[PDB]
Structure 1
Amino acid sequence: RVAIQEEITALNDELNRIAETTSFGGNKLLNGTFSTKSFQIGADNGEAVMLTLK
């Protein structure tokens, strides 16, 4: 059970590494600092869609 726990902890640290390091040109996505960002899709101002990354 301890031997299995070793790979559980290695994989759990793997999830936290994915969350903290995944980025789009340095803009971290999966660690929760992205929050909600609005993407302007339209020829006039005020037409944007809210993307939420958790």
Structure 2
Amino acid sequence: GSNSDADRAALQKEVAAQQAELTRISDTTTFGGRKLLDGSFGTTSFQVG
């Protein structure tokens, strides 16, 4: 309601926890020590022929 919840500070803490959870989902994808979607992915190309 743009004026009712004076705990927009708690809202900010919770959304900051949410974005930190996002950055953690970015990490912990260590499928071979070559982290897929976060960090620096070499943009490889799998040979099929």
- Structure 2: which 5+ runs fail to align? 1-7
Higher strand share: 1
Between 1 and 2, higher relative CO (CA 8 Å, sep ≥ 6) is seen in: 1
- Structure 1: which 5+ runs fail to align? 43-54
Runs of 4+ in 1 over 4 A off after TM superposition: none
Q: TM-score, normalised by structure 1?
A: 0.63
Q: TM-score, normalised by structure 2?
A: 0.67
How many residue pairs were aligned?
Answer: 42
